[PDB]
Write a protein that binds this ligand. Structure first.
Ligand SMILES: [Mg+2]
Ligand SMILES: [Zn+2]
Ligand SMILES: [Zn+2]
Lengths: 146, 98, 900, 195
C-alpha cells in the first residue's frame, strides 16, 4: 500500500450513516466502526454498511485503496476500515453468483493493446485484499470448481 | 519543515519563517567550482555520491511584515536510481545503452 | 634450570609498591602533539621501551628482551579498592571499634582455635565456618572490654557507606563514612585476630586494601597503535590513566590553597569513581566510561575475561604454526591409514631431521637439490643456532662437509607422521595420526571407510593437518594414535571404522544364490583386491555351461583358516528354514560340508574352517553399527590382521559393483493398476471414519477419555486412525514390488535407505504435524483460505494424500512446507545447547586418572572410586556390558581341539 | 469512561472500592513524584510528574496538558480490553497474523533520518546568529537578514549526517544494519536482494 490523506475518508463516512461518539451508548448496539485503530462513530446495521462501501469501490467513486472487513462474533460486532501506508496485499478476481466476472471478451483486449491492469481494477474485476478483508472470503483454486 | 516554523534567535525582534523546497537535477561541483550533471555510471566509478542539491527559501519577519524571501541551499540529498527524480526516468532503450 | 613449585597469593603493601616502582608520574600528558613522544611522566621516564631508543633504567634494554616496569601515583586521598568492598563490609560490621576486638566470648576463642585443626583439609567445609562468625558478631552490642560504647549500625548498597548514630536522644541521621576514617580503624586491629578471620598476617593486611598509592602498569602491556602512518591511536588503558592524573593535579592544588571544605567532598567522590571504572567498567550503578566516539573502554576486568580473554582465548588455547587447510575428495585405492597431501602443501611444511650417521647420504642430496625439486630442503641449522636459508644463488658451498650434528629442515616425504582434524571436535577420536602419501592436485584425500569417525561427507568440507616436529612428540603420535588402534569405539564396543554405502550392497551381489562368475572375472578381481594368491582358484564347480566358479569361494579366500561363526541377519523372511539348519548344527557339531549343507538359505551365515558354506553378506558383517565378523576378528587375530581384512574387502566389493551395474531409473517406484485401487479404497473409508467421529462430538455422544478434556480426546483418537491408515497402505506396496529392483536391495541390507521412504514415494505421506499438534495456526478457525470455517476434517487440517510421483496439489504442498521448516530450525537450535553442556562435564571431570593399584583419585587425594569402574574391565574391550565372554570361548576352543 | 455494560460495571466497583479509601483526588499526582525519588523533593516532586505524564503517557494523542482529557479515554479503553477477556468476550490476539504487522520501508525510514539531520542543522544555525550579532554590531538594516542568513549556514553539516549513517547502517533511532551492500553475483541474486 502507498498512502492517502486521512481527512477525505473521515468526511466521506459521516454522510453515509455514521453516528458519532457523542450519541453512542454503545452496548449492546452492533456498532464500533474503526479507522486505522482509532474508534470513530457507530452505524446501526452491519450488513447494510459493509456491502455499501465495497459496492462503491467497485464502481469508481471512492479511491482504490480502501478495504472493509467484518467481524462476526456471537455477541461482538466490529466493522474495520483500513487506510494506513504499509500493509501487504494480494490480487484476486471477483466471482458473482457462480460466474467468474469479465470472461474472454476482455482477455483478447488484454492480449491486444487496448487495455491493461490499470483498466481492470478501475472497471471492478480485480480486487486487492488485505490480510484482514481476506478473513471473510472463501476462495476457489481453479475455474473448474466454482 | 512545517513542524518547526519560527523558533529563535535570542533577540526578540528578528525571526525566520520557513518557506518551500525544490529539488534540482543531479549535479556536482568539484574544486575550482563548476556544476555539471552526473550520470550514474560515472558516479560508481570514481567514488562520488550521486546526489541533488536541496534549495530552501526563508521568510525574514521584521516585526510582522514579510517583504523579501531569499532561497538558500541547505545541503545535498542521495537519490534513488530509476526513480522519478533522477535522470533515467522514462528514458528509452537506445539511450540507456548510451 | 628450575621449575615452579607453588604459587602463593596475597595483597601488595603500599610500602612494597614504592620499592617495586621505578618512577612517580606527575605529568598528565601523553604526546602533545604528533611529535616527540617523550615526557617526565607516563612515557619512558626510565619506565619502559616501545621505541627503537635504547634509553631505559640504566639497563640498555632495547624493545626485544625488555621487561616493562611499574610506576606509581602518590594519591592525595585514600581510595577504596573495588573488589574488596563486599568483603571490607564483612570486617566493619563485625568488630568492636576503638580497641580492635572480635565481639566474641572466651568460650568461642578456645573452641574455634581447636576447630581449625580438625577441619584443616577441605575447602568447602571451612568456607561455611567463616560465615557463622559474621553471624554471631552482628547480634551483639555489649563488648566485654569497653562497656558497650554505642555501636552504630553499618550500611552498604552499593559502595557508599553510612552509620545510624544517635546524638541527642534518638536521631537517625545518615552520617557518611569517610575512607580516611575507615583506614585509621583498621590499623588498630591486632594481628592475632587475623587467624580468626580468613586472613594471613604476612601476606594480607586489611589496612592495605585502601589504595593510598596506585601502581602504574608498564609500557610493554600498553602498546601504541598507529592509525594511518604517523597518527597514534591511544590505548584504552593509556586513555584513562592520563585522565586519572589530571583529576589528581587539580585536587592537590584544591586542598593546598582553596579551603571551602564543600567542593572537596564533591571532588573526593570523583577520584573514587574515576579509578573504579578502571578496575571493572561493567559494574552496576556505574555509567560506562566511554571512549569519546561511542565505544566503551575495555578495562582490566574486560581484559581478563569476556569469552575471549586471557585464560581460554590466548593462554590455554593459542594459534599455531606448521598447519594447512583445504577441501577433501575420496579415493578407495590407498590403505586405511594413509592420506593424500597436495604437492604445494608438501613443500611449505617441513620436519627437522638431525642427521646422525646413517641418513647422511640422504640429506646431502636433500640440500644439494635446492628448495625447488621435490626432494629438497629449506632451512639448515648449525649447532650454534644461526639458521642459514638455502634459496639464494648457491648450495654447493653449503653442501660441503656437513659436519654431523646439524639439523636440516626438508619437505615431507612418504612416511612422515602427520595428524588430522575435523573442527567441530566432539569426541575422542576426531584426531588420528595418518601416514603421508604425496599426489599431485589440490585436495586432501581420505580413504572411504575412515569417514564415520570424522563425521564427514564430500560436499566441500574442510580438514586441517598439522605436522609435529620434535622427536619425542612424533613417536607418541605413531604408537598411540594410528588408525588401526581405533577400529572399535569406547562408547558401545562395536566397530566404528567399517564399511559404507557401496561396500554393503556390493557384498550382497557377490553372495546371492546365482552369482556365478566366469574364469576371466575371477582372475581379474583377485589381482585388483590386493591379494597375492597363486594358481588355486580351484575346482571349477559348475562346468555345465562353461568352467565357472561360485560366489562363495571367492569370498572364502579372505578369511583366516580356522573361523567358526554362525548367526542370523536382517534378510530372514522365513524363520522355519533357518531353524532346520540350526537344529542339525547344535546336535552334530561338525557335519560334512557337502551333503547336508546344500539345504542352505540366504539368511543364515555359517562359516567353518575359513570356508563360507551358507550365507549372504549384508550390514551385519561390517558397518558403522554392529557387525559381528569384523568384531570377532579384532579380538582373536590381533589388530594388524584386521587392517588388511578391511583393506581387501573394500577393493574386492567395489570391483563387482562396478562391472555388474547398479542403476536406478524411474520405473523402480511404479505400482500396477490393481495395486493402486487397493490403496484408494483405504483412503476413502479412513476419511469416512474421521467424518463419523466428528459427528459423535457434535451431537453429544462424547465417550470421554479419563485424562484429557473433550477437545483433546477428539484430536487424540483422530491421529491414531490416520496413523493406521498410512501404515496399512505401506504394507500393500511392500508386499507387491519384488526384491529384484535396485531400490529394495539398498533398503533390506541397509545402505542409505529405510523401508519408510520407499513406501512414502508410491503411497501416502501420512499426516503432517508440528511438534505433536495438528496444524492449527492460521485464520480464525480455518488454516488456509480455501476451506469452509468450523471444520475439523482430515483433508482440511493437514493431511496429504498423494505420492511424490502423483503430484502434490497446492494445499497439500503448502501443508508440506509447514512440516518442513520445523525440521530445519531444530538443527541449529539443538547444536548450541549440547556444546555448552559439554563444557560443564569436561571441565568438572578432566582431573581423574587411574593409578597402578586400580583407584580413581581426585587432585586432593580423596578416593573417588575403588577398583576402577566396578572392577575392572576397560569399556573399549568389554563385550556388550559383560566381561570375559565364556560362552564364545568354550565353543571356539572345543571346535579347534576336536576338529584339528 | 470505562464502560456502560452492567456485567462489566459490577466488576469495576470491586477494584475501585478496595483502594479508593487510601488516596483522595489530586494527591496521587503528587504521589508519582513521591515514588520516582524520595526525601521531600518539592521542586523535583511536582515538576517531574508533570514532565513524565506529558511526555510518556500515550504520546500519539498529544503533548499538551489540554489533551489529558483524551488520554483518559484511550487508556480507559485498554483497561476495558483486559477485563472482557477475564470474563471471556473475545479471543486471544496472535502477534504473527499479518493483519497487525506492517512494513516500514525505504520511504518511511529515510524520513526519520532526515528529521534528525535537519533538526540538528537548525540548532547549529541559531548559534551562528547569536555569536555574530555583537562581533560586528550593526549593518545594512533590510540587507542584514539578506547577509546574516547566507553566511550563518555552512552547508556541510546536513549532508555528512545523511551519508555516514547510511554508509554504516546505524541510525540514530536505534536500528542497526539497515544498509546492506548490494549482493551482485548472478542476476537472480541481485533481484532477490531487492525483495
Ligand atoms: Mg559438510
Ligand atoms: Zn627495562
Ligand atoms: Zn574490647
Amino acid at each position: 500500500t502507498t498512502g492517502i490523506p486521512e481527512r477525505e475518508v473521515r468526511e466521506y463516512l459521516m454522510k453515509m450513516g455514521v453516528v458519532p461518539i457523542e450519541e453512542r451508548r454503545p452496548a449492546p448496539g452492533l456498532y464500533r466502526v474503526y479507522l486505522n485503530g482509532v474508534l470513530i462513530g457507530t452505524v446501526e446495521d452491519g450488513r447494510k454498511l459493509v456491502e455499501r462501501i465495497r459496492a462503491d469501490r467497485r464502481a469508481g467513486k471512492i479511491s482504490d485503496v480502501i478495504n472493509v472487513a467484518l467481524y462476526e462474533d456471537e455477541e461482538v460486532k466490529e466493522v474495520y476500515i483500513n487506510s494506513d501506508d504499509g500493509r501487504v496485499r494480494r490480487p484476486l478476481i471477483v466471482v458473482e453468483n457462480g460466474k467468474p466476472k469479465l470472461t474472454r471478451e476482455h482477455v483478447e483486449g488484454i492480449k491486444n493493446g487496448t487495455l491493461t491492469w490499470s483498466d481492470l481494477i478501475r472497471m471492478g474485476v480485480i480486487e486487492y485484499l488485505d490480510a484482514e478483508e481476506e478473513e471473510n472470503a472463501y476462495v476457489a483454486t481453479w475455474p473448474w470448481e466454482v | 519543515v512545517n513542524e518547526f516554523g519560527e523558533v529563535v534567535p535570542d533577540i526578540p525582534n528578528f525571526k525566520v519563517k520557513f518557506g518551500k523546497i525544490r529539488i534540482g537535477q543531479p549535479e556536482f561541483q568539484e574544486a575550482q567550482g563548476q556544476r555539471r550533471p552526473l550520470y550514474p555510471m560515472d558516479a560508481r566509478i570514481r567514488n562520488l555520491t550521486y546526489s541533488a542539491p536541496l534549495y530552501l527559501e526563508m521568510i525574514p519577519v521584521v516585526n510582522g511584515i514579510e517583504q523579501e524571501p531569499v532561497e538558500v541551499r541547505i545541503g545535498e540529498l542521495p537519490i534513488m536510481l530509476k526513480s522519478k527524480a533522477c535522470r533515467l526516468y522514462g528514458l528509452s532503450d537506445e539511450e540507456l545503452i548510451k | 634450570k628450575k621449575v615452579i613449585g607453588s604459587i602463593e597469593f596475597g595483597i601488595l603493601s603500599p610500602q612494597e609498591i614504592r620499592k617495586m616502582s621505578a618512577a612517580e608520574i606527575t605529568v598528565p600528558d601523553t604526546y602533545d602533539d604528533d611529535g616527540y613522544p617523550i615526557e617526565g611522566g607516563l612515557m619512558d621516564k626510565r619506565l619502559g621501551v616501545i621505541d627503537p631508543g635504547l634509553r631505559c633504567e640504566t639497563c640498555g634494554a632495547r624493545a626485544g628482551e625488555c621487561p616493562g616496569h611499574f610506576g606509581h601515583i602518590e594519591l592525595a586521598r585514600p581510595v577504596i579498592h573495588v573488589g574488596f568492598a563486599k568483603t571490607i563490609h564483612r570486617v566493619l560490621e563485625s568488630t568492636c571499634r576503638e580497641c580492635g576486638r572480635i565481639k566474641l566470648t572466651d568460650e568461642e576463642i578456645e573452641e574455634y582455635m581447636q576447630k581449625f585443626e580438625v577441619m584443616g583439609d577441605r575447602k568447602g567445609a571451612v568456607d561455611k565456618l567463616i560465615k557463622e562468625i559474621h553471624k554471631k558478631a552482628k547480634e551483639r552490642m555489649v563488648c566485654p572490654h569497653c562497656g558497650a560504647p554505642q555501636f552504630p549500625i553499618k550500611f552498604e548498597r552499593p559502595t557508599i557507606y553510612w552509620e545510624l548514630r544517635k546524638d541527642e536522644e534518638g536521631n537517625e541521621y545518615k552520617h557518611r563514612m569517610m575512607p580516611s576514617e575507615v583506614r585509621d580503624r583498621l590499623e588498630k586491629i591486632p594481628d592475632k585476630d587475623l587467624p580468626l578471620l580468613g586472613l594471613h598476617p604476612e601476606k594480607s593486611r586489611p589496612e592495605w586494601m585502601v589504595l593510598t598509592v596506585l601502581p602504574v602498569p608498564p609500557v610493554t602491556m600498553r602498546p601504541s597503535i598507529t592509525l594511518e602512518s604517523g597518527i597514534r591511536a591511544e590505548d584504552d588503558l593509556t586513555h584513562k590513566l592520563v585522565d586519572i592524573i589530571r583529576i589528581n593535579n587539580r585536587l592537590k592544588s584544591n586542598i593546598e590553597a582553596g579551603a571551602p571544605q564543600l567542593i572537596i567532598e564533591d571532588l573526593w567522590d570523583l577520584l573514587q569513581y574515576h579509578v573504579t571504572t578502571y578496575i571493572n567498567n561493567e559494574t552496576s550503578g556505574v555509567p560506562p566510561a566511554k571512549h569519546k566516539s561511542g565505544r566503551p573502554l575495555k578495562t582490566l576486568a574486560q581484559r581478563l575475561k569476556g569469552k575471549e580473554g586471557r585464560f581460554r582465548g590466548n593462554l590455554s588455547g593459542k594459534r599455531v604454526n606448521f598447519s594447512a587447510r583445504t577441501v577433501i575428495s575420496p579415493d578407495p585405492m590407498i590403505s586405511i591409514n594413509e592420506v593424500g597431501v597436495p604437492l604445494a602443501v608438501a613443500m611449505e611444511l617441513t620436519v627437522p631431521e638431525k642427521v646422525t650417521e646413517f641418513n647422511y647420504e640422504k640429506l646431502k642430496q636433500r640440500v644439494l637439490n635446492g628448495p625447488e625439486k621435490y626432494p629438497g630442503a629449506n632451512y639448515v641449522i648449525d649447532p650454534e643456532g644461526r639458521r642459514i636459508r638455502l634459496m639464494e644463488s648457491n648450495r654447493e658451498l653449503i653442501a660441503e662437509k656437513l659436519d654431523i650434528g646439524w639439523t636440516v629442515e626438508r619437505h615431507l616425504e612418504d612416511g612422515d607422521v602427520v595428524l588430522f582434524n575435523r573442527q567441530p571436535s566432539l569426541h575422542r577420536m576426531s584426531i588420528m595420526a595418518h601416514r603421508v602419501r604425496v599426489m599431485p592436485y589440490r585436495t586432501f584425500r581420505l580413504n572411504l571407510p575412515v569417514c564415520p569417525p570424522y563425521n564427514a561427507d564430500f560436499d566441500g568440507d574442510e580438514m586441517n593437518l598439522h605436522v609435529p616436529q620434535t622427536e619425542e612428540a612424533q613417536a607418541e603420535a605413531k604408537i598411540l594414535m594410528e588408525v588401526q588402534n581405533h577400529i572399535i569405539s569406547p562408547r558401545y564396543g562395536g566397530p566404528l571404522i567399517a564399511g559404507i554405502q557401496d561396500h554393503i550392497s556390493g557384498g550382497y551381489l557377490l553372495t546371492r544364490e546365482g552369482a556365478y562368475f566366469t574364469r576371466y572375472e575371477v582372475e581379474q578381481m583377485l589381482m585388483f583386491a590386493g591379494m597375492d594368491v597363486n594358481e588355486l582358484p580351484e575346482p571349477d564347480k559348475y562346468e555345465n555351461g562353461e568352467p565357472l566358479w561360485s560366489g562363495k569361494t571367492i569370498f572364502s579366500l579372505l578369511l583366516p583358516d580356522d573361523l567358526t561363526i554362525w548367526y542370523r541377519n536382517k534378510l530372514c523372511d522365513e524363520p522355519e528354514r533357518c531353524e532346520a539348519l540350526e537344529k542339525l548344527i547344535e546336535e552334530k557339531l561338525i557335519p560334512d560340508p557337502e551333503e547336508v549343507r546344500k539345504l542352505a538359505y540366504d539368511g543364515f551365515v555359517y562359516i567353518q574352517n575359513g570356508k563360507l558354506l551358507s550365507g549372504a553378506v549384508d550390514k551385519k558383517a561390517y558397518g558403522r553399527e554392529d557387525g559381528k565378523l569384523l568384531d570377532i576378528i579384532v579380538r582373536e587375530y590381533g589388530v594388524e590382521r584386521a587392517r588388511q581384512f578391511l583393506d581387501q574387502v573394500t577393493k574386492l566389493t567395489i570391483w563387482v559393483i562396478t562391472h555388474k551395474g547398479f542403476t536406478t531409473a524411474i520405473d523402480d517406484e511404479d505400482l500396477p493398476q490393481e495395486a493402486i485401487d487397493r490403496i484408494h479404497e483405504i483412503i476413502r473409508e479412513a476419511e469416512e471414519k474421521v467424518q463419523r467421529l466428528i459427528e459423535a462430538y457434535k451431537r453429544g455422544e462424547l465417550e470421554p477419555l479419563p485424562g484429557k478434556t473433550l477437545e483433546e480426546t477428539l484430536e487424540s483418537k483422530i491421529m491414531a486412525v490416520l496413523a493406521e491408515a498410512r501404515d496399512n497402505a505401506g504394507k500393500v506396496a511392500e508386499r507387491y514390488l519384488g526384491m529384484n529392483n535396485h531400490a529394495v536391495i539398498m533398503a533390506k541390507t541397509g545402505a542409505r535407505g529405510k523401508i519408510l521412504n520407499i513406501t512414502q514415494m508410491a503411497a501416502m505421506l501420512g499426516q503432517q504435524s508440528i511438534r505433536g499438534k495438528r496444524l492449527y495456526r492460521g485464520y480464525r478457525g480455518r488454516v488456509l483460505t480455501h476451506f469452509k470455517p468450523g471444520d475439523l476434517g482430515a483433508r482440511a487440517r493437514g493431511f496429504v494424500t498423494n505420492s511424490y510421483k502423483s503430484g502434490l496439489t497446492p494445499q497439500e504442498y503448502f501443508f508440506h512446507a509447514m512440516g518442513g521448516r520445523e525440521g530445519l530450525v531444530d538443527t541449529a537450535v539443538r547444536t548450541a545447547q549440547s556444546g555448552y553442556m559439554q563444557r560443564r562435564l569436561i571441565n568438572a571431570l578432566q582431573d581423574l586418572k587411574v593409578d597402578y593399584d586400580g583407584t580413581v583419585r581426585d587432585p586432593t587425594g580423596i578416593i573417588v572410586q575403588f577398583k576402577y569402574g566396578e572392577d575392572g574391565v576397560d569399556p573399549m574391550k568389554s563385550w556388550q556390558g559383560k566381561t570375559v565372554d565364556v560362552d564364545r570361548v568354550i565353543v571356539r576352543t572345543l571346535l579347534k581341539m576336536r576338529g584339528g | 469512561a470505562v464502560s456502560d455494560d452492567p456485567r462489566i460495571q459490577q466488576v469495576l466497583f470491586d477494584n475501585l472500592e478496595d483502594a479508593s479509601d487510601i488516596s483522595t483526588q489530586e494527591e496521587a499526582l503528587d504521589y508519582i513524584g513521591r515514588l520516582a525519588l524520595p526525601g521531600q523533593p518539592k521542586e523535583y516532586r511536582l515538576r517531574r510528574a508533570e514532565h513524565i505524564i506529558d511526555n510518556n503517557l500515550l504520546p500519539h494523542m498529544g503533548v499538551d496538558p489540554e489533551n489529558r482529557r483524551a488520554k483518559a479515554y484511550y487508556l480507559g479503553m485498554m483497561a476495558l480490553k483486559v477485563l472482557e477477556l477475564s470474563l471471556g468476550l473475545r479471543g486471544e490476539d496472535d502477534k504473527d497474523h499479518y493483519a497487525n504487522k506492517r512494513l516500514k520501508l525505504a520511504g518511511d525510514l529515510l524520513k526519520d533520518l532526515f528529521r534528525v539531520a535537519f533538526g540538528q542543522l537548525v540548532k547549529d544555525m541559531q548559534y551562528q546568529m547569536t555569536k555574530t550579532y555583537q562581533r560586528k554590531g550593526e549593518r545594512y538594516t533590510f540587507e542584514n537578514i539578506q547577509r546574516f542568513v547566507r553566511n550563518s549556514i555552512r552547508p556541510d553539516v546536513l549532508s555528512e549526517r545523511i551519508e555516514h549513517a547510511l554508509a554504516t547502517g546505524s541510525w540514530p533511532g536505534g536500528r542497526t544494519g539497515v544498509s546492506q551492500l548490494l549482493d551482485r553475483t548472478n542476476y537472480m541474486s541481485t533481484l532477490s536482494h531487492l525483495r
